[PDB]
């Protein structure tokens, strides 16, 4: 059994908890339970491999920003979540991406860009800008909805495959 330390990051209210709870409970929360820090240990089969996922569901509220350095040190890969239809000029994705690079003193930390809430009205330009951002950064982009489950397994499993690749290199 192979272990993977995944961390879900992003601004408050973007859907980190809803994505995690879709994966582990097969349920859409349809409720905002603002996070401090929750940690899950889950045995999941990915590509036929039995995986132990240690998933840290982190706080996006700015009042909890001091907790970031600790979870960035321990995390092996990061889901960087934003609301596709409210990308805020990528400001939060850029800050989390830089903080991860600085804390881990590494330019190639496993990372997936997750554009969540794609069930809500979304402009073509915002979907295309997200795809071009991910291409510029050399990381995958996955469009998700915690409401419909679109993309949820793809986001988490893509991050696990990137950690596999990083380890094999």
Ligand X SMILES: Nc1nc2c(ncn2[C@@H]2O[C@H](COP(=O)(O)OP(=O)(O)OP(=O)(O)O)[C@@H](O)[C@H]2O)c(=O)[nH]1
* Chain positions contacting ligand X, by CB under 6 A: 10, 12-18, 29-35, 59-61, 116-117, 119-120, 145-147
Query: Cα separation of 42 and 72, whole Å?
Result: 20
* Smallest gap from residue 35 Cβ to Mg ion (A): 3
* Smallest gap from residue 13 Cβ to ligand X (A): 4
* Smallest gap from residue 147 Cβ to ligand X (A): 4
Select 9 or 159, whichever has its Cβ closest to Mg ion. 9
Residue 61's binding partner out of ligand X, Mg ion, none, with CB under 5 to 8 Å set by partner kind: ligand X
Select 29 or 46, whichever has its Cβ closest to ligand X. 29
Among 9, 22, 35, 77, binds Mg ion (CB under 5 A): 35
* Smallest gap from residue 60 Cβ to ligand X (A): 3
Residue 87's binding partner out of ligand X, Mg ion, none, with CB under 5 to 8 Å set by partner kind: none
- Tokens representing 6 are 């995944």
Residue whose C-alpha is closest to residue 130's, from 81, 75, 78: 81
Residue whose C-alpha is closest to residue 85's, from 124, 43, 52: 124
Q: Closest CB to ligand X belongs to which residue?
A: 60
Q: Quickly count: other Cβ atoms within 10 Å of residue 161's Cβ.
A: 15
Helix-strand-coil split of the chain, %, nearest 5: 40, 25, 30
Q: What Rg do the C-alpha atoms of the chain give, in angstroms? A: 15
Taken in order 35, 144, 46, 159, the sign of the CA dihedral is negative
* Smallest gap from residue 64 Cβ to ligand X (A): 8
Among 11, 17, 100, 152, binds Mg ion (CB under 5 A): 17
Any idea which residue has 């240690």 for tokens? 54
């Amino acid at each position: 059994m192979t272990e993977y330390k995944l961390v879900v990051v992003g601004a408050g209210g973007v859907g980190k908890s809803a994505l995690t709870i879709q994966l582990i409970q097969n349920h859409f929360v349809d409720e905002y339970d603002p996070t401090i820090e929750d940690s899950y240990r889950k045995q999941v089969v990915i590509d036929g491999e039995t995986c132990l996922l240690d998933i840290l569901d982190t706080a996006g509220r700015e009042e909890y920003s001091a907790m970031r350095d600790q979870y960035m040190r321990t995390g092996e890969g990061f889901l960087c979540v934003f609301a596709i239809n409210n990308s805020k000029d990528f400001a939060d994705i850029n800050l989390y991406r830089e903080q991860i690079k600085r804390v881990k003193d590494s330019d190639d930390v496993p990372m997936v860009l997750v554009g969540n809430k794609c069930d809500l009205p979304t402009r073509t330009v915002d979907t295309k800008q997200a795809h071009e951002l991910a291409k510029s950064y050399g990381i995958p982009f996955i469009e998700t909805s915690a409401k419909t489950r679109q993309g949820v397994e793809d986001a988490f499993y893509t991050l696990v495959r990137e950690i596999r690749q990083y380890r094999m290199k």
